[PDB]
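Researcher: Checking consistency across runs. Here is Pp-KAI2-like E again:
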Amino acid sequence: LLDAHNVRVVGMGSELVVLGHGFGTDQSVWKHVIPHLVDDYRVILFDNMGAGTTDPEFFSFSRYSTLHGYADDLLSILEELEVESCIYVGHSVAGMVGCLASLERPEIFTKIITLSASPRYLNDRDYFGGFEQDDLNQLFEAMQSNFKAWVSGFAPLAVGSDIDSMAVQEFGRTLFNIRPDIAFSVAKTIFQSDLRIMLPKVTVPCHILQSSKDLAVPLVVADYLHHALGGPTIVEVLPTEGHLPQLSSPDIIIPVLKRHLAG
């Protein structure tokens, strides 16, 4: 592999840091953040399977029907790279994927930093995730009725900000580039996932980073992960709007992510 996930390892720093991305983008979501990590950290970047920068020959609809397929990829990349010990930074579902990987090898991860991560988008009894199943059905029907019109309305809500903003236009490009059946299946694997039962067995320290205004992750989800993760945790709410604040507001995320990387 490595070439299969477009693994790039840049930097000269002492500490290893792995950067993961969420649905609809790729490792270029960190493009504004990387140059501020190279001096103090050795940065490891990779693309999730199914992304627009990825060959559909390697995407298995059965392997990625659960988030275990994404966690096995992460553990397989760290094995090939001979990673003994690193900090893992995970955006959106990749933050939960990093927690799922720490269940199998907790000694690899000294620290987990989650950005806009949620263990479950579905509401439930005494759990506010944000979405009802009829909200999911309409998003799954609209995604299959007109995939391009769905992207045009999903990207400004996901990133926040204006439709003429550069970040919204770039996320829309990367999201549109996912093959529509692959995008439909991955969106079903992600929006219907429920990782609340694995949280108390996570023993890796997690720094829970969250935007104050995130439409896919309510602010109370950051507090749920604060009490339910079994390892030592801390929460920092970012003064940003949107689910991809490292893309649309990098100048705010850089100092906060840097302080949590060293603390």
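Researcher: Does this match what you'd expect to see?
Model: One thing to look at in this run: The first helix runs from residue 68 to 80.
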